[PDB]
Every structure is written in C-alpha cells, then in structure tokens.
Design a protein around this ligand. Structure first.
Ligand SMILES: [Mg+2]
Ligand SMILES: [Zn+2]
Lengths: 50, 50, 101, 98, 79, 189, 51, 161
DNA sequence: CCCATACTCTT
DNA sequence: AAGAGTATGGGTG
C-alpha cells in the first residue's frame, strides 16, 4: 500500500518504526492463519488450540 | 564538466545524472532492517573492564 | 473546453517566480517555466531544494507572475534556475545530487 | 489559493491579506533584497507600483494586458501620499521639490 | 535561447544591456508591427528577439541605424 | 560604479597555517582576484604573471607548479573610487565566473552571503616539537649561549618556521622569551 | 573464484548509506550500534556514568 | 586580546582588515562554512568611512572634526590641483550599527532607525534629500540605481547637469 | 542589554 | 575646581 524511503531512518534515529513494522507483520501473519482456518470450516478444538 | 565544457552541457549532464541515479536506486532494492545494526561482540567485556 | 487550449497557448514561454519564506540569500526566489498539471500541489525539481532549503513534509511556496516584457526578460536572463548553478557566496555548485541519486 | 485582482484596503489602497478575503501574497523586505541582489529593477518596480497601490497604474496595466501590449506607466504609490499627510498632521512641513 | 542565454550574453557583453536590447526588439515586434528576422517557430517575441541577438542580427547599433534610416525615409516620403 | 581606478595598492596573500597544521592553501585565496604586482619567480627576476591579471584556474596551476607562497592582490578596501568601487579591485563575480559587471549591488550580496549561514552557529554557551622533516628558520631572534650550555633567545617576538624543500612554511610557532633551542637557524631537522 | 576466502568492502545497507555520503554520519551510527556515551547536565557538567 | 582600534592606529588599514577577516573566518571554519573573503572586506570598507582631521592646512576644515573620507579626499585633490596644501587625517573605525546611523539621507535613516529622533533632527536642521540610494527609490516606487536600472539613472545625471 | 546623561566623591 | 564613577532613563529584541 505504501512505499517509504529508507534514507529517512538512519539520521533521525527513530528505530521504533522498524520494530513496529516487524511486529505488525507478525500480528498480520497470526491473523492470516486464523482466517485460513475459519474459511475452511474446521472444529472449534483446533481453533482454540491454535 | 562546468569548468571544461561550459553551461549547457553541465545542465544536460545534471539532468541525466539525476535520472540515472533515481532509476538505479529503485532497481537496487536497498532497504533497512533490524539486523543491519550489528553490535560488536566485545562490547560487554569492554563495559565490564571499564 | 476552449479556454483550456487558450491557457495552454498563453503560458507556453511565460516564466513564473517561485519563492519560499524565509528568503536568505537571493536563491529563495527563482524563475521556472510552468507545466500545467492536475491536482492542487506545486511540483518542484529535486535538484533545487537545497537552494530553497525545502523538503516535502508540509512546506508551502508562493508563485508570482511577471507582466511586462522587461520583467519577463529579467526572469529569463537573470533569475532562471539554469543561470544560478554556482553559489554567489563561494563559487561552488549548488545543484548537487543528494540522497537517492 | 490564487488571485489575479480583487478588493483593496480603503486607507493604504493595497491588496488584502488572507484566503478568506481573497487576498494577495506579501512581498516583504527579504524578497526586495533578493531582487536587488539579482539586479532585476523592472521586476521590483512592477511589484511595487502597478501590482499593489498605483491606482491609475493598475487600470492602465490591466487595459494594456487585455489589448496585448505588455508595458506599464508607473506612478506614485498611495502609501507615500498617506505618509506625507500623516507627517504634515504632526506640524512638520515635508514636501516634494521641483 | 529557450533554456540558456549564454550565447546572447557573450554577443552583447552584459546581461543588463542584453535585457534592455531584447526588450526594445521584442516591443518592436509585438506593438510596432515589424517582422522577425529569424524563422518563427511558434515562439514568443522575447524568445525570437533573443534568438535574433544570438545570431548576430540585432544589437543597439543596428537598431539605432535602422531607426535613423526609417526616420529619414519617412521625412522624405512626407512631402 | 567604475571599471578601473588605476591604483597600485593591494594586500599580501599567503597560505593560512596554524601551528603545525595547514588550514588554507594559497590557491583558494587568490583564485579570481586581480594581481597588483608582477609575480616574479622565486629564483630568477623574470616575470611569471604580469600586472593586472585575473587569476583563473590555469594561472593557479601555473603558480602551484613554481611553488609561489605569496601574491599581492587588489581589494575593495584600498580602492580609489569614491561613492563605489571599481571592477578590477573587486575581481571575479563568483556566481558567474567572469569579471564583475558595472551596476551590481555588491553590498547586498555580501550581507546575504555573511548572514545566510548564521543558523549553523551556536547561540547559547610547553615545548615545540616539529612533526615534518625540514629546516628550522627563526624570525626576530636574539640568541646567546649561557654558562649552562643552552642557546637561550633574548627576544620576545621570535617566530619559528619549518621551511621545506620548496621554500614553504610547513609549520609556524611562537617562541616565548627564555626558551632553550636545541638547534640554531638554518639547521635541518 | 578459486575457492579461497577474501575480505571486501561490506554491502551492509547502513554502511552503504553512510559511506557514500547519501545520509548519516559516524556519530549517528555509533549511537545506533554502539553505546551513546556521556551526557551533560543542563548547566553543562558531565554526568560520570554514561549511557 | 588586542583591540581593533589600536591595530588600525599603530599598524594600518591592511593590518586591521586582515585581523577582522582572519577572526571571522576562524569562527566560521569551525562549522565547515565556506565564505569568500571579498564580502567581509566590503563590510570592513563600509566600516571605515570616517576620518579625523589632525591638521587643516589650506583647507576649510577644523583640526578636531570627523567627516566623510571621500569628501576629505576630494577636497585634498582639488586644493592640490589649485596649488595649495591639503589636510592630513587619521582613519576611524566604527561598528556597523554606528556606521549605518551616519547616513546622509533622512528618508533612509527614518526607514530603519528610530523615526522620531531622525524626523525631529531633520526638521530642525531643514535637510534636503537627493534620492540617490536604493532604499529611497524603493520607497517612492522608482527604478533602483543598480542592475538593469543603473543606466537609466545615468541618463538622469546626463540631463540634470 | 547597551549607550547617553545628571548627581556625587576625589586630587 | 576639574575628573572619574554611579544611578536613571531611552530604544532594542
Ligand atoms: Mg519542512
Ligand atoms: Zn579600484
């Protein structure tokens, strides 16, 4: 959706955005696994285990 | 280029330089990540000695 | 629809003056040839930003129109960005690539 | 925001300020210094008289532009007349010579 | 002449005098109803005057000589 | 407001050297100025650069080939023109490259050039050891040997210079009164 | 190419950005990847224990 | 730390201008700022615009006044042409704030100085302004005597006298 | 904060 | 009776 210039990070020293990007990628991955499990109707046991 | 050739060639050269730099910076795919900030392995022992 | 063709005809070789405040060293006002674009923002050449000390995070600029023939020729021959390449303070070039280039 | 022509102040006869009033942009002292450093005398004179407060010059310039003749006939700014009247109201005789 | 005026500056020898000579020629071509000395290529009168100057066809002396010749011809043809 | 006042005055330009480190080379201090004197070769009496020459890049290269360390140039301070200056006492127009034209407002340009970098300036708050090989030179020196076998200088304005193989001052130092010199004048170190 | 080991200039992104002069400097890289160092009190004195 | 006035008095104009240029460049070089020495020299030249007469000679001056250096030089050369003996003088050094306060135009002075003092003094003295500088012509909407307007003003001098 | 002026103690 | 020094006021940001 968005393209940002990496040249704006090293001189500003605001490294929180890189870590936020990594953690948001991880959270979206977990959500993607949940959505894939929900699409193909599965048991509640597998959902609650995951 | 300005001192040897003149004014108009310098303007043309500057425009071409900007175009080429933008194109190849885009092509490189240069990014920034958390693993690019490598901490030296001897930092802890130097701190301990100090 | 015809007034747009008229407008394209009347701005063909008519320079305009771009200025960003605060003006410090006479390179804060320069002359450019307009290219008509859609939208509401002014597009600026990347190589002149250092002369204006400008960046694209909220800066604004003002535009002025020369009227008489003498003013238009002064804009073309004195204030055009292709004439102001060397610094008047030390003689070094000011249109120098930076960052991505 | 942009403007070609509009309304003016009653006292100074200069364009108003602000986007709400459809006003113009200010050409301050630093811009004047930049124009002086360039050497653009005609641009500066045109900015100072027929664009701000030369009441006859504005009309003549507009007519000439519509007729296709790009020439100006500058006069005295109205603010200088206002300044002369204000200084005279203080009991000081200031006047133009020849 | 459209992007740079270096050749015209070299020909005239001064930017400030170049502006005045070009303005005089452009006003002649725009209001005086005279014809350009170079092939018009969809350019404004200012650019045409600059291209004439950089071609060696227009300078202050040439303009003065042309003006005096036209004045003399008008004086002769008045009677 | 004028072209040439004809004056023969000027100021001397030499490289700016602080202590044992060189700060400003000569070429950056004479490029674009008009010579007020004939530049003679250090060895001969022949004229290298004549009077009233605009020192562009070629002349600077020629001067650095012959190892010239001092040039007299014209400056606006010592200009004979009244109510203005002349083109030759000012010199090159830096923004363009050629000589300055008549009718230019140089005061506004100078004020802007000085004032623009003003936002980069902060607003809120016992021995001489020569580093480079060369020869020792002394200026305004009054030396005498005491009974302790020391060459003590009795002058208070002594300047110690390091002269290289090309006759250039590599290093400059201030020698306080009462110092003991290991070597005399003109001795290689 | 012969199978040996060689040492060359790094292609690290931050190092490439700083070495070319495109962005950054030595002090900022030191703050990113090494200790920040000694800090000063508002008057101007140096705090003994650094970051 | 020596004072510039003593440098000018004992060593000369070149010494004091070299001193000021060196000090300013030393301040600017710590931050990596490149400025040519011409600009500081023109500022210094603007600082050295007054002279004190030490001997009047065959002039119309006193021996304890302070006047424009250009007027002194013109009077000296005129008297020397007339065969008489000129005056001797010593240069002065003033700060920019004080140097700019000694302008010979009351419009220009009232533009940026304290308006009340300038206007009162000019009215008492009954001064007359010739409109020769850039700021004066900017005030009354004329062409500045510089750049493309410069030649224009010359024609004025060609017709007035 | 910096400079000019009226009032006070000293040689 | 001059002369150097201190308290007060104006204009500046
Ligand atoms: Mg910004
Ligand atoms: Zn001169």
């Amino acid at each position: 959706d968005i393209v940002l210039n990496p040249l704006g990070v090293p001189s500003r020293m605001n490294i929180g955005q890189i870590l936020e990007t990594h953690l948001g990628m991880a959270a979206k991955g977990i959500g993607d696994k949940i959505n894939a499990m929900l699409k193909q109707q599965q048991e509640v046991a597998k959902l609650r285990e995951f | 280029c300005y001192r040897i050739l003149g004014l108009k060639p310098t303007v043309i050269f500057a425009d071409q330089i900007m175009y080429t730099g933008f194109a190849y910076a885009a092509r490189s795919g240069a990014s920034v990540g958390i693993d690019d900030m490598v901490i030296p392995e001897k930092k802890h022992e130097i701190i301990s000695e100090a | 629809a015809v007034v747009w063709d008229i407008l394209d005809e009347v701005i063909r070789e008519h320079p305009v003056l771009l200025n960003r405040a605060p003006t410090l060293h006479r390179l804060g006002i320069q002359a450019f040839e307009p290219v008509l674009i859609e939208g509401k923002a002014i597009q600026l050449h990347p190589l002149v930003c250092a002369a204006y000390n400008a960046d694209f995070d909220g800066d604004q600029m003002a535009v002025h129109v020369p009227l008489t023939l003498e003013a238009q020729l002064e804009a073309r021959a004195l204030m055009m960005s292709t004439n102001n390449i060397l610094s008047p303070a030390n003689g070094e070039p000011i249109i120098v690539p930076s960052q991505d280039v | 925001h942009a403007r070609s022509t509009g309304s003016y102040s009653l006292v100074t006869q200069q364009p108003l300020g602000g986007k709400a009033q459809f006003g113009g942009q200010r050409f301050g002292e630093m811009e004047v210094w930049a124009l002086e450093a360039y050497g653009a005398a005609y641009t500066l004179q045109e900015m100072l008289t027929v664009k701000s407060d030369d009441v006859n010059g504005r009309t003549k310039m507009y007519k000439n532009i519509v007729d296709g003749n790009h020439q100006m006939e500058p006069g005295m700014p109205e603010s200088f007349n206002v300044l002369l009247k204000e200084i005279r109201s203080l009991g000081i005789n200031i006047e133009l010579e020849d | 002449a459209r992007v740079t005026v270096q050749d015209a500056v070299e020909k005239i020898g001064n930017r400030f005098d170049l502006v005045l000579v070009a303005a005089r020629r452009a006003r002649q071509m725009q209001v005086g109803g005279k014809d350009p000395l170079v092939p018009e290529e969809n350019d404004k009168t200012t650019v045409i005057a600059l291209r004439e100057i950089e071609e060696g066809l227009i300078n202050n002396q040439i303009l003065d000589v042309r003006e005096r010749q036209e004045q003399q011809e008008q004086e002769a043809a008045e009677l | 407001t004028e072209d040439d006042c004809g004056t023969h005055e000027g100021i001397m330009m030499t490289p700016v050297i602080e202590g044992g480190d060189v700060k400003e080379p000569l070429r950056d201090r004479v490029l674009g100025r008009v010579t007020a004197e004939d530049v003679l070769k250090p060895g001969t009496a022949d004229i290298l650069v004549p009077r009233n020459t605009l020192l562009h890049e070629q002349w600077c290269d020629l001067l650095e080939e012959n190892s010239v360390d001092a040039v007299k140039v014209r400056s606006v301070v010592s200009c004979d023109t009244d109510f203005g200056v002349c083109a030759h006492c000012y010199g090159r127009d830096l923004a363009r490259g050629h000589i300055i034209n008549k009718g230019e407002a140089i005061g506004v340009i100078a004020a802007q050039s000085i004032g623009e970098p003003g936002t980069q300036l902060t607003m809120r708050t016992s021995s001489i050891q020569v580093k480079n090989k060369g020869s020792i030179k002394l200026s305004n020196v009054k030396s005498v040997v005491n009974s302790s076998g020391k060459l003590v200088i009795t002058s208070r304005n002594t300047e110690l210079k390091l002269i290289d193989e090309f006759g250039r001052t590599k290093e400059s130092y201030k020698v306080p009164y009462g110092a003991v010199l290991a070597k005399g004048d003109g001795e290689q170190v | 190419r012969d199978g040996q080991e060689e040492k060359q200039v790094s292609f690290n992104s931050i190092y490439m950005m700083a070495d070319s002069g495109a962005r950054g400097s030595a002090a900022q890289i030191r703050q990113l990847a090494g200790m920040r160092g000694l800090m000063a009190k508002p008057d101007g004195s140096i705090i003994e224990t650094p970051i | 730390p020596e004072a510039p006035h003593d440098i000018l008095r004992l060593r000369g104009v070149h010494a004091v201008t070299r001193y000021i240029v060196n000090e300013v460049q030393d301040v600017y070089r710590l931050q990596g700022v490149k400025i040519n020495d011409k600009h500081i020299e023109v500022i210094v030249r603007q600082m050295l615009r007054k002279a004190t007469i030490v001997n009047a000679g065959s002039s119309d001056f006193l021996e304890g006044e302070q006047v424009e250096y250009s007027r002194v030089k013109i009077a000296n050369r005129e008297l020397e042409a007339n065969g008489k003996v000129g005056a001797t003088y010593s240069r002065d050094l003033l700060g920019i704030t004080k140097a700019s306060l000694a302008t010979e135009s009351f419009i220009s002075a009232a533009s940026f100085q304290e308006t009340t003092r300038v206007l009162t003094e000019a009215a008492v003295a009954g001064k007359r302004d010739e409109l020769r500088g850039l700021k004066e012509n900017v005030i009354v909407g004329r062409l500045i005597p510089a750049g493309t307007g410069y030649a224009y003003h010359q024609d004025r001098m060609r017709r007035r006298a």
